[PDB]
Amino acid sequence: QRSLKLLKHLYHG
Amino acid sequence: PGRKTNQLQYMQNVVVKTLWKHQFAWPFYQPVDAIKLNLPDYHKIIKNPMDMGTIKKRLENNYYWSASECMQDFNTMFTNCYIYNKPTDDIVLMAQALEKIFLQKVAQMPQEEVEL
Amino acid sequence: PGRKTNQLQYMQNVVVKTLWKHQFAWPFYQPVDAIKLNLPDYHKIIKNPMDMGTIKKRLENNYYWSASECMQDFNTMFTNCYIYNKPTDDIVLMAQALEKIFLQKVAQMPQEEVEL
């Protein structure tokens, strides 16, 4: 979750 | 009324150039697309969006009267990231690392602003 | 309800103690009183109010189980301010300065939470 925004992965990972 | 100054040249050819090459800069190259990326309430919280692609275009087109204005846009970009995301998110750590380089470069900018 | 942890001690004696002394902290010492302050739309817009006085008291009364709760209460406090107020309002610039210090201290907090 800490990479969520990055994912799409960065923001929501 | 835009302007060409020694400090604005430095913001374009040192600050933006340096940050763009950093491996953490890519989330900041373009505006946050809240619908594409599924970001709840992004524009409810972030009312003054900013990104490094916009700052780069502003410098390339002499949008700013003063480097102080460009420094303000960088601060909006970093702070928007600090505001919207959660305190321990990876993107916040990336933004903090980029802001550290930003501040290091600003420290070496010519201290008096001269129109060219 | 709560317990003692190394991270909660850090939140109390580093994060809150630093922010409480900051020149911009005073708008956040108490809950927003929408009646006294003449804010008829505040509770229409803000459904989860939070302030630093409440956070400080929760720390002193061992209300929190984990520092993650305290960090989220700070995030809620700051985000509420940006949702309610305009991006040019002085209170929002004050919130941003406080939130940058908050995030600086969070980056340096003990990374493993240990009950004490």
Does a structural domain hold residue C116?
no
Does a structural domain hold residue B84?
yes
B4/B7 Cα distance (integer angstroms) = 8
Does a structural domain hold residue B36?
yes
Stated resolution in angstroms:
1.5
| Radius of gyration of chain B from its Cα atoms, rounded to whole angstroms | 14
Does a structural domain hold residue B3?
no
Chains A and C touch (3+ CB pairs under 8 A): no
Return the SS3 of C115: strand
Domain membership of residue B46 as a residue range: 8-108
C84/C91 Cα distance (integer angstroms) = 10
Interface of B with C in 34-53 (CB under 8 A): 41, 44-48
Q: Are A11 and B91 in contact (CB under 8 A)?
A: yes
C51/B17 Cα distance (integer angstroms) = 40
C59/C115 Cα distance (integer angstroms) = 14
Tell me the chain C residues in contact with residue B93 when contact means C-beta distances shorter than 8 Å: 107
Interface of B with A in 31-70 (CB under 8 A): 37-39
Interface test with B, best of C46, C71, C96 (most B CBs within 10 A): C96
CATH number of the structural domain spanning residue B80: 1.20.920.10
Tell me the chain B residues in contact with residue A5 when contact means C-beta distances shorter than 8 Å: 27, 37, 39, 85, 89-91
Q: Are B93 and B37 in contact (CB under 8 A)?
A: no
Q: Which long-range contacts (CB under 8 A, 24 or more apart) does B108-115 make?
A: B108/B14, B109/B7, B109/B10, B109/B11, B109/B14, B109/B15, B109/B67, B110/B6, B110/B7, B110/B10, B113/B5, B113/B6, B113/B7, B113/B66, B113/B67, B114/B5, B114/B6, B115/B3, B115/B4, B115/B5
Domains: count for chain C: 1
Does a structural domain hold residue B21?
yes
Asked if A8 and B85 come within 8 Å (Cβ–Cβ), the reply is no
Does a structural domain hold residue C75?
yes
Chain A nearest C-alpha distance from B81 (Å) = 10
